[PDB]
Design a binder for this molecule. Structure first.
Ligand SMILES: O=C([O-])CC(=O)C(=O)O
Ligand SMILES: O=C([O-])CC(=O)C(=O)O
Lengths: 436, 436
């Protein structure tokens, strides 16, 4: 048994999970888990248990769990870079794929794998280099990833009629390839838009994925590489129901390769209801700081907040959520900032707001959850390190999110998930149906 | 009242449908329409009523209906080109959008609209021209459409904080623009791949959409233009549950613009379980014809089919479907072929199979629907007219399918449909849930 080759490890895990699901469906396949109402159909399947997605699960008490592990558990258990304290995305992906915390050796192996597979074909480089500056970074990302499907081993093998039993293998290879390439596509977009088309340089075969990424972005600050490791780890997955995960799932169910599936997912992520909360918080912070200065007292800030909520406006990043308490993905970033930039004026405001907003929201009685989420904290940190181009923040989210959705995609094909095909009805149709 | 401006007509229809749904949801929003089982979750939401999609509805006895009209009814009622017998796609789109059969004047107006809006921006032209020959036509299509989102009026307006009440308007404008541009994108792909990069030439402002399309493809046979009109009409829509419709719906629900939504949908359409059936039938027909020769007897062909099924293989185009009889989209194409290429040897085989395969499948008693679908007939017709490049066939399907999904998209935003967000569960999670 190979102790580092993820593919071999995954081959040994698959049959056992297949057997387990086969037995589960024999015994409980007919078990009802919910009802479908008219309202659910009009309201985007809200509250409808609709799909199986294995890699992550929202714990109402603890926040998002990656294969049963909470964020704080991942923070402790996942390997780090040498001389680093943030969990490496590699180890997260290993976790999502195998269900097991990787060893150091396993993480180091994965790093080398993604470094080896990182080449872009010249047609994708040419295409990126020709895009104009008014083409949104997310559109460049999706178009380039679609154009990378020329490299798909799965598309080619399916056309030669390979056995169903081998689908996950080729899906695994393509997903590994795509993950390897993403930092190169993303950095090329960053440089072409915001560094006058300068080169991304080379991949170093001895660096982790995050560090090749920050190098290609043109950053040379060890704590920005640490932020990037954390960022990429914690945004990696958040169940199957969000649009980006669901889009990848749905497209992937037609046996579209991972490049096609992931690019479609990015078009969903680009949606202003899925993809912009981080930017929105940062815009609002920046306006607030311009209005009241960089050194407002707790008392004046409490009045400002009181007045903003009383005039029907929200505080971005606060007030929505299933969670009873602060999103651990917020806490992570607060810890980071307390260690590395405690004197930063914008961070101090973000920290002031953390003390004040929740108690004001409780008092006003309007919001069910007064605590902030991950997007409340991310922007201030990216800006601190020089990453000020807010349009680009969603590309970072997408590079992260590739980890979760592609880890699931492998499993979807390993377990033989069929085509996603719900039944639609018209309003006219539904009206007739209910009269019966 | 404007008698030709679709936008004004649509503005008068919307409030009445809003009112009707508001009332329907007050009275029956809580009405249960179905149950969710464990099996449905593992099986891609099969048999789960999951969404409202207005533009078309599958009649279990008669096939697909476009706003209540069957395909043969649409064949009679929809306007034709001058000196033509086939229904214009323009009139189909008008039908899906308004629920009304358009007049001649309305169709003529729509043709001019799509001719006026047909320009490609230079960056999309450059990108297409630089794609290499090994990049699949569907990938080129999706990438170009994503790159066209720089032209989205909706994306821009949403970022300036437009009222929800106005979403459909800009969605309407972008959808009209995209539909106008698609033949240009598709023909550029065709010419760059298969006509040595020659130009697509001009849009004639007095031609219908289909005829500008066939002109830009480089075709001159009037009956190929007639095929194209029929083809584009009948593939336009098929409820919301198929992957391309559903992907557009899902992405569109995040308020991604129609370019992003449509491009994601094409990545779903590119999937071998949604979009390769046409090519697969044609490959199998060609092999069969080589093996048994032209003018094979009924008897020899029946034996061939029995032997294929008895050796565990299926006959492509036959045997799957929820429909209990021949797909009307198949019948349409058979009628076309009987009129225009009755003595074509491949067509004769397709017709022989129609006589024999279903009877054999009935006799065998296994496959629950023995009749063929649309993809059983399309390839022989395209090949007859010189469109032999099978990789390209799915682009035609996608240009057609734009009509349905974008007609619905306008309505989805008009009616205020929210983000599509089902709940996912893991296997471990589902097991715990059922024990409770
Ligand atoms: O995608 C995610 O991280 C889940 C999501 O949209 C949210 O709950 O805000
Ligand atoms: O969307 C389509 O028309 C192809 C398809 O899957 C169906 O006909 O059910």
């Amino acid at each position: 048994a190979s102790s580092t080759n993820l593919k071999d490890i995954l081959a040994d895990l698959i049959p056992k999970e297949q057997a387990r699901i086969k037995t589960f469906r024999q015994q409980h396949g007919k078990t009802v888990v919910g009802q479908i109402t008219v309202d659910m159909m009009y309201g985007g399947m809200r509250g409808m248990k609709g799909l199986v997605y294995e890699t992550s699960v929202l714990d109402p008490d603890e926040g998002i769990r990656f294969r049963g592990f909470s964020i704080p558990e991942c923070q402790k258990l996942l390997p780090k870079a040498k001389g680093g304290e943030e969990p490496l995305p590699e180890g997260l992906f290993w976790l999502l794929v195998t269900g097991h915390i990787p060893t150091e050796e396993q993480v180091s192996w994965l790093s080398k794998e993604w470094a080896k597979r990182a080449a872009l074909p010249s047609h994708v480089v040419t295409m990126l280099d020709n895009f104009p500056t008014n083409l949104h970074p997310m559109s460049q990302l999706s178009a380039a990833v679609t154009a990378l499907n020329s490299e798909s081993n799965f598309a080619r093998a399916y056309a030669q009629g390979i056995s169903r039993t081998k689908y996950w293998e080729l899906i695994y290879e393509d997903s590994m390839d795509l993950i390897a390439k993403l930092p190169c596509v993303a950095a090329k977009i960053y440089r072409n838009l915001y560094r006058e088309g300068s080169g991304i340089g080379a991949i170093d075969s001895n660096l982790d994925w995050s560090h090749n990424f920050t190098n290609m972005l043109g950053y040379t600050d060890h704590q920005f590489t640490e932020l990037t490791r954390l960022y990429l780890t914690i945004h990696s997955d958040h169940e199957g129901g969000n649009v980006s995960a669901h889009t990848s799932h749905l497209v992937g169910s037609a046996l579209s390769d991972p490049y096609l599936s992931f690019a479609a997912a990015m078009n969903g992520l680009a949606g202003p209801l899925h993809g912009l909360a981080n930017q929105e918080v940062l815009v609002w912070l920046t306006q607030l700081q311009k209005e009241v200065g960089k050194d407002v007292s707790d008392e004046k800030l409490r009045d400002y907040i009181w007045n903003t909520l009383n005039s029907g406006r929200v505080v971005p990043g606060y007030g929505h959520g299933v969670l009873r308490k602060t999103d651990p993905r917020y806490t992570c970033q607060r810890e980071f900032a307390l260690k590395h930039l405690p004197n930063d004026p914008m961070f101090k405001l973000v920290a002031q707001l953390y003390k004040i907003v929740p108690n004001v929201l409780l008092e006003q009685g309007k919001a069910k959850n007064p605590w902030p989420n991950v997007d409340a904290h991310s922007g201030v940190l990216l800006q601190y390190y020089g990453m000020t181009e807010m349009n680009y923040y969603t590309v970072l989210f997408g590079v992260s999110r590739a980890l979760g959705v592609l880890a699931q995609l492998i499993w979807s094909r390993a377990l033989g998930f069929p085509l996603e095909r719900p039944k639609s009805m018209s309003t006219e149709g539904l009206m007739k149906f209910v009269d019966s």
